[PDB]
Amino acid sequence: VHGIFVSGFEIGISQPSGYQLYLHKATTARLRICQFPSNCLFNKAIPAHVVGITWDNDRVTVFSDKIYYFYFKNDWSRVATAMQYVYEPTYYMLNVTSAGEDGISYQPCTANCIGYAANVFATEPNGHIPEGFSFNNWFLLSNDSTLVHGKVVSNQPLLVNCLLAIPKIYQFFSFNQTIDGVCNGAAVQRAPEALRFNINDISVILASIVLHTALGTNFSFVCSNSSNPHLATPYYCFLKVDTYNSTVYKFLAVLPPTVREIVITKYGDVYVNGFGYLHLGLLDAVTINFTGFWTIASTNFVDALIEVQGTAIQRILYCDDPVSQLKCSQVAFDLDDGFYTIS
Amino acid sequence: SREQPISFVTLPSFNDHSFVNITVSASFGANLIASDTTINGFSSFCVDTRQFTISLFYNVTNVSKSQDSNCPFTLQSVNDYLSFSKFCVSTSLLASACTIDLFGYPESGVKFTSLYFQFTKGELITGTPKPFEGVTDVSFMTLDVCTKYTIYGFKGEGIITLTNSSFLAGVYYTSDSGQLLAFKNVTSGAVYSVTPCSFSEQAAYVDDDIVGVISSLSSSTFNSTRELPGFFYHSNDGSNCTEPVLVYSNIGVCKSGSIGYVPSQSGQVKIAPTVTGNISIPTNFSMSIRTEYLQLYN
Amino acid sequence: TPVSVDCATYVCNGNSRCKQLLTQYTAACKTIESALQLSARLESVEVNSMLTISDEALQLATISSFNGDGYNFTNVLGVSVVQKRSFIEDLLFNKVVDEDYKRCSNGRSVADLVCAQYYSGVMVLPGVVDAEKLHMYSASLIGGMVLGGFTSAAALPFSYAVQARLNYLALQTDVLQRNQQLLAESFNSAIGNITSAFESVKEAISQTSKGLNTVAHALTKVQEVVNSQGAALTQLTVQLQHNFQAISSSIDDIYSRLDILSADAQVDRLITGRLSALNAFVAQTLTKYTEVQASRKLAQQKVNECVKSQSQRYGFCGGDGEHIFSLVQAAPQGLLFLHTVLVPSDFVDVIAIAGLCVNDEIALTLREPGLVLFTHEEYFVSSRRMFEPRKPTVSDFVQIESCVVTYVNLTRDQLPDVIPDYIDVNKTLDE
Amino acid sequence: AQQKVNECVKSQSQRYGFCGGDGEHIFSLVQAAPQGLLFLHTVLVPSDFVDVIAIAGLCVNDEIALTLREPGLVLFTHEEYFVSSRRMFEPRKPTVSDFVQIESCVVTYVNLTRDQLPDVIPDYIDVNKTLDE
Amino acid sequence: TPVSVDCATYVCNGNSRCKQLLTQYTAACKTIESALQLSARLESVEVNSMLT
Amino acid sequence: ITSAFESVKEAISQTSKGLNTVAHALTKVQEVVNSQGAALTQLTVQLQHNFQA
């Protein structure tokens, strides 16, 4: 039973060397994730009055008032204490316009539910990416190397001004103004420092992206599979460098079989899958033109603490709040009791 | 532990090669009457292809030649697969550029020319030694052997093997020491792991010779190899070791090189005080003298 | 845990031209390697020399061979099954915590930190003592507490080992053997509290309780020892990254880009920098060995004085109380001691008698300074350490030539009611 | 080194294992050494043990419990009643001055009568019998 | 007497651009500060525990 | 002991060269003496160093 919910009462989830979970409440719950016989990862009271715990992969989610997310390589197969014991996942589409408990709908989700859920999120008022987001196609942007595992504090284009979900372009994205469109959730009236493109089907674009530089040169990405009328003398991508008195095609790369993310910054750096492949001069804008993306987002560079596992992103903490600023300095999501130096 | 194949890895590309022909013309030794240096005819040239080669040609009439370089590379070494993101060469001064000075000694030397090199680092442009022919994929490598390699800009020697790991990000992975540990083949998604061609090992030296070796390799010049938890032991004696000469922890090595475990040291039994019942009372005492040294001063 | 570093590999990582340059500094490499190889050899000798094991004692420390009586010891003794760690030892090792190098030469996997350090020339040696040897050592020390003699039918019942220890602190006059049950019960409660302290102590621990000679303090110390163990290895490894004013931090990079003589000059800069990093490592490593030796010497004194014997030094074992016995448990990188100490709950208020005088002729005082004569709670004597009274005997007193104002004024006909075994021989003979 | 001289050389240490290690200390000698001192610790080591049965104490005629005063002294019957230090098998017969009276008896004490006492403790005198008879 | 040092202030004395550069070395600062804060905590505990 | 100080290495076991033995104490004496000048030569050698002059 991957999910166990309830409508003294208790929940017990088990696999002995790791952690197992127990929760108890009566009519606030005490949640204990510990190395129980027959120390603790977590041992605290949580507000409570349905109530339930769902765990899949290496995350445990506790649903008791605020949704709590615990990141740990757990191995659970059975659970013991109306009760709902859930072994098969489902999907709902939520329409929130009301900004309160009176959500408009929780419509059964009928298409692309996994992909939509994995890539689309509502933005928080302060531009934060909400806790619990999977960062499915989000990468840390590194010019050289890859952090395979560990915790890093770094300056990354992770603060969201505006996220356009399932965009339809049939659009000029300026780095001097805000981006036009309907933002999913909160929006911040700021120009982007970077444009993050989360790709659903790259053939949509291969079948136009133009970087408009500060000095007036138009850089266009041209990709082609077995057709080269102007390129000669699998897709191959060329960078068309179009200036007022000249057009040339520079070969850049054989297109990687899978491209999940492209990040274009204001300073010109273009990252495909987090490798900083091409650095151009400063950009004023990016033009997108196609009839293909899960999301397009306008973001800004902020310091953040990122946990990396197998090169994937999880658990991002933003270093804005004074409590968070301390956590970033000690490079730890959780800091024990003690005195710490702050300025 | 104890003619290498050459390996070369770049982001995927096909043959796309141009030459940078630098010609230095001059006549003399009574110094020069005249000189003129051009790059592909022009006073300057920038590389716009994925691969390029620099070829220096002299056309000098009368002469010994040499170069004085303030660059990270020489005119000859620049063609040994070095990678750049930008690369321009000029006989004129370029901003933020290094200089290579070309001199002649005609038999009273002269400077023929100054080549200014403006460049930035990255993977896009590579100074290969020559054009590739019949090549759909410029990158190449030899696996499971010691090889000399240039991988994504990293040079060194090592053994490249194929792993079953898979990562979704970047191009390469490194150690805390900045060494390449692994790299990805972008087209296939395969990850390769790179180890040194030689490893540190501990030798057991007894009397005047090597009695055996404790190592990470199963292959040696000894005729007897044993696998111990955590290491291999090479010797010319694979039998039980009953009389260790060298000991570390519980590992003992005999003079013949046999290896075995060293048993726990026994010691004096002390007797517990007892109020009632079967007890033993010590007798037949003899003296034993223990030796201890303590430093008093420095 | 000792470390050994291959100087040439660290400094010149496979480049043969670099090694030729390094040759002029061979003496530096010899110095670096010698210090690490010899120091490791010494730690191996001293630890293994110290931790001897008694077979007669080891055999008496199992769950079935240790005849505890009242006193529990289940969580202290090892587990026969081949023998495994005790419950307390298991909690400590699992709460806080040899490398395999046969894998580092295989490729196939992406190297982890240990293999990457190995590739760089840094080897972490097997521990000088295996965890199982620390376990057998500790089991031997405990089993030895009941080794009352050789060839006997059974281990000395634990309570007899205890009664003998109690007699050394004070002769016991209460021999009802009920006191042993009361002490056993307090012992068992103390073990239960320790066993539980190792499991989530932080839930409810006060400032007094986390201070010296407590579980939280000792447990914290064990974690600090383990957590800092690799701290020097990573400084040595990180410094390889450093570019000591060269084109590249990589020797192979430099030789493949510059001409040979210019390359020689920059590689020599890298060599000096790398040799400096090795010397810093060695100095840190040698310093740490000295600090550990000081702790090891103390641990040996504690075993010989608190475990194998009953210390007469107030405050040495446990601290602030009367020592009875101590137990030893294996711990990461060392030993954990459990010191069983008596603490009084109440005091008996009595009036001390400086001495007696009989008929103005004889001054009688006690021979032993640690024994006190008193009249409250008839004349009795008891050790100053415990209220264990008995009536005095003749053999308790000696004659002093002079009396003082603090001695009791008795006559010969009263003496016998003060000292029951006193006989006035002339009166018995004449009457 | 100063502690070793004061405790192992000028005096006989009572701390088990301090001087020499694992044995009974008798005396230590000191020799000069480069930069310091070298100590030679002379320690006794037993070769054999004598196997005896310990007597917890004696009871006489159900009225008096007699135990030894000194915890380090052991009463035994093998190898007649004798007492010796627990450290060395150096027997002598017990005397009156060795024992003290304890109010209660235990199951581990030897059951003796007054007419047997004198054959257990040779110096014991029953004064009433000598006076009456 | 224990000492505690604010890594960022010592290294980057109020300059915000410097602090952004310093971020790549955050682990060094954490190491420096942790050693001093924990050592001070330990000396406090042992001295006050001892002096009853 | 007197003999142990004269060629102990000819026939000494692991037990015999451990703590509180002649071979251990003798080894320690040599280490103390051999390392005595180790710092003097680092101070002296550094005079050789050219600090960018």
Ligand SMILES: *[C@@H]1O[C@H](CO)[C@@H](O[C@@H]2O[C@H](CO)[C@@H](O[C@@H]3O[C@H](CO[C@H]4O[C@H](CO[C@H]5O[C@H](CO)[C@@H](O)[C@H](O)[C@@H]5O)[C@@H](O)[C@H](O)[C@@H]4O[C@@H]4O[C@H](CO)[C@@H](O)[C@H](O)[C@H]4NC(C)=O)[C@@H](O)[C@H](O[C@H]4O[C@H](CO)[C@@H](O)[C@H](O)[C@@H]4O[C@H]4O[C@H](CO)[C@@H](O)[C@H](O)[C@@H]4O)[C@@H]3O)[C@H](O)[C@H]2NC(C)=O)[C@H](O)[C@H]1NC(C)=O
């Ligand atoms: C892979 O490598 C890449 C190449 O190195 C890395 O790229 C670097 O990325 C960093 C991080 O984004 C860039 O830092 C940023 O630099 C910005 C401007 O620098 C240029 O212009 C400066 C002049 O104007 C700026 O500074 C003056 C003060 O001096 C201010 O008054 C202005 O308001 C303005 O900010 C100049 O001083 C610089 O020298 C630089 O000039 C450029 O030099 C190159 C060299 O060849 C040249 O080619 C360019 O042509 C030349 N430019 C010009 C115009 O001639 C700077 O503005 C940024 O500070 C702002 O933004 C950051 C976030 O990015 C905030 O942290 C700051 O608080 C500040 O925020 C302000 O602006 C925000 C922008 O929207 C706004 O939202 C805020 O509200 C606020 O107003 C920042 O310091 C760096 O420039 C860049 N390298 C280069 C050379 O481009 C990649 O990072 C790396 N990828 C990874 C991560 O792996």
Ligand SMILES: *[C@@H]1O[C@H](CO)[C@@H](O[C@@H]2O[C@H](CO)[C@@H](O[C@@H]3O[C@H](CO)[C@@H](O)[C@H](O)[C@@H]3O)[C@H](O)[C@H]2NC(C)=O)[C@H](O)[C@H]1NC(C)=O
């Ligand atoms: C990285 O992985 C890629 C993908 O496997 C490797 O490319 C492959 O290289 C082989 C050998 O050259 C190619 O096989 C050849 O096919 C052609 C016909 O197309 C044939 O004429 C040759 O005789 C040979 O069989 C293969 O096509 C090619 N695969 C792809 C899709 O690229 C590449 O070699 C690896 N990188 C390195 C370092 O080489």
Ligand SMILES: *[C@@H]1O[C@H](CO)[C@@H](O[C@@H]2O[C@H](CO)[C@@H](O)[C@H](O)[C@H]2NC(C)=O)[C@H](O)[C@H]1NC(C)=O
């Ligand atoms: C790069 O593309 C931009 C965008 O189309 C070009 O700017 C346009 O210029 C035309 C000239 O007739 C104007 O009519 C449009 O209003 C401009 N559009 C925008 C959004 O600026 C620009 O000319 C191109 N640059 C080059 C090198 O040709």
Ligand SMILES: *[C@@H]1O[C@H](CO)[C@@H](O[C@@H]2O[C@H](CO)[C@@H](O)[C@H](O)[C@H]2NC(C)=O)[C@H](O)[C@H]1NC(C)=O
């Ligand atoms: C630079 O010199 C190269 C020689 O390395 C020239 O390439 C040659 O061109 C001739 C033209 O007839 C051919 O016959 C040769 O086969 C070519 N040799 C090679 C190795 O390619 C090249 O023309 C020169 N490049 C420029 C830009 O002037």
Ligand SMILES: *[C@@H]1O[C@H](CO)[C@@H](O[C@@H]2O[C@H](CO)[C@@H](O)[C@H](O)[C@H]2NC(C)=O)[C@H](O)[C@H]1NC(C)=O
């Ligand atoms: C070597 O240099 C000489 C000049 O010293 C070159 O000869 C000149 O060639 C150009 C181009 O054809 C003519 O315009 C000049 O008239 C020639 N000058 C002389 C001195 O006759 C010659 O071409 C060069 N050789 C090479 C290999 O390029």
Ligand SMILES: *[C@@H]1O[C@H](CO)[C@@H](O[C@@H]2O[C@H](CO)[C@@H](O)[C@H](O)[C@H]2NC(C)=O)[C@H](O)[C@H]1NC(C)=O
């Ligand atoms: C490894 O080689 C050694 C020789 O260096 C072998 O030792 C010899 O064994 C043969 C057996 O017939 C004897 O006749 C020789 O007298 C031995 N030589 C020596 C060293 O005296 C040894 O047998 C080999 N090791 C193994 C695995 O057995």
Ligand SMILES: *[C@@H]1O[C@H](CO)[C@@H](O[C@@H]2O[C@H](CO)[C@@H](O)[C@H](O)[C@H]2NC(C)=O)[C@H](O)[C@H]1NC(C)=O
């Ligand atoms: C060294 O001695 C050990 C101990 O006798 C040998 O290990 C034994 O190997 C035999 C093989 O016939 C087994 O039957 C025993 O069970 C093993 N004993 C144990 C528990 O170690 C070992 O073979 C000897 N090593 C060599 C290669 O001589």
Ligand SMILES: *[C@@H]1O[C@H](CO)[C@@H](O[C@@H]2O[C@H](CO)[C@@H](O)[C@H](O)[C@H]2NC(C)=O)[C@H](O)[C@H]1NC(C)=O
């Ligand atoms: C002696 O200690 C043992 C070990 O803690 C006790 O045995 C435990 O008894 C409890 C009773 O609730 C069980 O839950 C545990 O499973 C037992 N543990 C083991 C390993 O035996 C025993 O109760 C104690 N006995 C006395 C007399 O105190």
Ligand SMILES: *[C@@H]1O[C@H](CO)[C@@H](O[C@@H]2O[C@H](CO)[C@@H](O)[C@H](O)[C@H]2NC(C)=O)[C@H](O)[C@H]1NC(C)=O
């Ligand atoms: C030592 O403990 C004994 C036993 O508990 C104490 O005797 C008790 O004294 C209290 C006084 O309030 C009485 O209520 C109990 O009935 C007594 N218990 C028995 C049965 O003895 C004694 O007080 C303690 N000794 C001292 C010095 O106080």
Ligand SMILES: *[C@@H]1O[C@H](CO)[C@@H](O[C@@H]2O[C@H](CO)[C@@H](O)[C@H](O)[C@H]2NC(C)=O)[C@H](O)[C@H]1NC(C)=O
């Ligand atoms: C016990 O006897 C002593 C010794 O006689 C008494 O102390 C004396 O008291 C008289 C009183 O006049 C003094 O003159 C002497 O100087 C005292 N002698 C000493 C030894 O100081 C003492 O009073 C008697 N105590 C009791 C309890 O009767």
Ligand SMILES: *[C@@H]1O[C@H](CO)[C@@H](O[C@@H]2O[C@H](CO)[C@@H](O)[C@H](O)[C@H]2NC(C)=O)[C@H](O)[C@H]1NC(C)=O
């Ligand atoms: C202490 O030493 C004595 C003297 O050597 C031992 O007595 C000997 O016992 C052996 C037993 O085999 C006899 O062969 C000798 O004849 C005895 N020697 C004499 C003359 O006494 C005695 O065994 C030792 N004590 C213990 C406890 O064994």
Ligand SMILES: *[C@@H]1O[C@H](CO)[C@@H](O[C@@H]2O[C@H](CO)[C@@H](O)[C@H](O)[C@H]2NC(C)=O)[C@H](O)[C@H]1NC(C)=O
């Ligand atoms: C010595 O005397 C003691 C005390 O009387 C004896 O122990 C008693 O044995 C009887 C047997 O019926 C029991 O009823 C009593 O409970 C026991 N008393 C004690 C002190 O526990 C003991 O048997 C005698 N031993 C010898 C050697 O005769």
Ligand SMILES: CCCCCC/C=C\CCCCCCCC(=O)O
């Ligand atoms: C329409 C153009 C969008 C795709 C542009 C592709 C950019 C170059 C492709 C080669 C990327 C090689 C470096 C990053 C690849 C990777 O890390 O997997």
Ligand SMILES: CCCCCC/C=C\CCCCCCCC(=O)O
């Ligand atoms: C302006 C600040 C003055 C500093 C005064 C310090 C007084 C309180 C001590 C705080 C630091 C204590 C060291 C760490 C102790 C701990 O971790 O609990």
Ligand SMILES: *[C@@H]1O[C@H](CO)[C@@H](O)[C@H](O)[C@H]1NC(C)=O
């Ligand atoms: C959600 O409801 C709003 C009304 O505010 C509507 O505009 C929008 O189309 C709805 N979205 C979905 C999920 O259909």
Ligand SMILES: *[C@@H]1O[C@H](CO)[C@@H](O)[C@H](O)[C@H]1NC(C)=O
């Ligand atoms: C656009 O950039 C110019 C550069 O000077 C700036 O003055 C202006 O404020 C920017 N416009 C917006 C919308 O911010």
